[PDB]
Amino acid sequence: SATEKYYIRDAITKPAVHHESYQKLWETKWKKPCEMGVYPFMFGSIKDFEPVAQEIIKKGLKEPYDWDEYAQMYFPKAEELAKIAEEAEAAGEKEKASEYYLRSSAVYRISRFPTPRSEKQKYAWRKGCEVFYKGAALMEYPIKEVRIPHKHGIEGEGDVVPVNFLLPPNASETSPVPCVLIITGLDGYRTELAVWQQGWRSKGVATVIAEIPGTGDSPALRQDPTSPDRQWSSVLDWIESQKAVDSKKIVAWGFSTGGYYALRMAHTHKDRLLATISLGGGAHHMFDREWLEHANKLEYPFDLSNTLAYKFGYPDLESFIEESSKFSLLNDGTLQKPCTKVLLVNGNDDEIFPIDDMFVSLENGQPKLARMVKGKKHMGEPESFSIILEWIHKLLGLDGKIKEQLAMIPSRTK
């Protein structure tokens, strides 16, 4: 009984209105964050998305979505913005060029939400990365792609871990800087969580942003629970080779599904990490039949359980549920291992991963730091962001100007 099993009880059986139509997704969930320029609309403008949303609403698109039909609706706006960026860059208008390339990247991004599962969505991922990096190259402090050799890779794995890298300008072997390794989620990849990098640069902190297995350009085997372990060995080896970065001050911050990987690597890579943070992560119950058979209809904008199944390399939900127990940090013995410093943060009412997974994390191995956010769903925002920045600032002895750091996240566009 799902209603008996989990902290949120009968909330698990109440289908969210945004699943009725794209119109309801826009009106009740997406219009607000788009207006505010925040996830999933970082670098984005209401001016770009509003006319796309109007055309989708007119068509009356709804679940089950044809992802090629859905994705195509965004391309005219994405192409328009890229054209404006190109003309700006030709005129030497670098700030305008950077803004419009990044606005283009945001439109391509939403077109391949929740994850690229069609040819046009895979195309939108490639196109989105292209215009993202064109915009990033034109930032005052350019964010660059590093194609980290996946030296720890096995048969069937890609040869590179593509990451974002930003080094603060004063960083050197004389004055080496901490590094925040941002682990992205099921739908937000390195082109999304990029929004955090300039804020960390301002505090004198390097940033590396990497995708979880079965998302973005992760080379990791989708179905292999140990595939993330090899990926982080390759990433951390590369960070160790950057002498401007203090290898003893690496903090891994996992966002959403990334939180699972942050919690996992606190154990698998204990000796190589100062600390890890799981924000809206899971560990065990996220893989339950009962949780996954309900989560498709809850707070996630689309079909969470099917999307998670695809990310784990299964062609349907049932095939994933058959094998999903093997990914549990409880079942595979991860949580019995010693860990580095761990902070767990989430909203109690999370309908993407259960708060019950915070409890499983606190029931096993060494004590861990926790902040629960009462009456808030996935991520427990915005207080979760302040809690985590406060902790990382204390840990790394930063300037404590966290409100200013958070105020830098919302997108400004013309």
Residue numbers in the entry: 1 to 414
Copy the relevant paper text.
A common step during their assembly is polyketide trimming, which Afyg1p, Wdyg1p, and PlAntI catalyze. In summary, the N‐ and C‐domains in all three enzymes are oriented in a back‐to‐back fashion forming an interface that encloses the intramolecular binding cavity next to the active site. The catalytic triad is formed exclusively by the α/β‐hydrolase domain with the nucleophilic serine located in the consensus GXSXG esterase motif. The resulting Ser‐His‐Asp network is perfectly aligned with distances in the range of 2.5–2.8 Å between the active‐site residues.
In contrast, in the zoonotic pathogen Wangiella (Exophiala) dermatitidis (Wd), the acetyl group of the hexaketide 2‐acetyl‐1,3,6,8‐tetrahydroxynaphthalene (ATHN), WdPKS product, is hydrolyzed by the Afyg1p homolog Wdyg1p. Single‐wavelength anomalous diffraction (SAD) was performed to obtain experimental phases for Afyg1p, which was used as a model for Patterson search calculations of the Wdyg1p structure. The N‐domains exhibit an α‐helix bundle, whereas the C‐domains adopt a classical α/β‐hydrolase topology. The amino acid sequences of Afyg1p and Wdyg1p have 40% sequence identity, which explains the similarity in their overall folds and active‐site residues (rmsd = 1.1 Å over 382 Cα‐atoms, Figure 3b). Although both enzymes differ significantly from PlAntI in terms of catalysis and primary sequence, their superposition shows a perfect match of secondary structure elements (rmsd = 1.6 Å over 244 Cα‐atoms for Afyg1p and rmsd = 1.8 Å over 247 Cα‐atoms for Wdyg1p). Interestingly, both hydrolases provide a hydrophobic tunnel beside the naphthalene specificity pocket. The 400 Å3 cavity of Wdyg1p is confined by the amino acids Thr257, Leu304, Leu308, and Phe353, which could accommodate an acetyl group. Hydrolysis of the Ser256‐bound acetoacetyl group finally restores the catalytic center and releases the products THN and 3‐oxobutanoate. This mechanism is most likely transferable to Wdyg1p due to the high similarity of their active‐site architectures and the GLDG binding motifs. Notably, the entire reaction in the hydrolases Afyg1p and Wdyg1p happens in an open state.
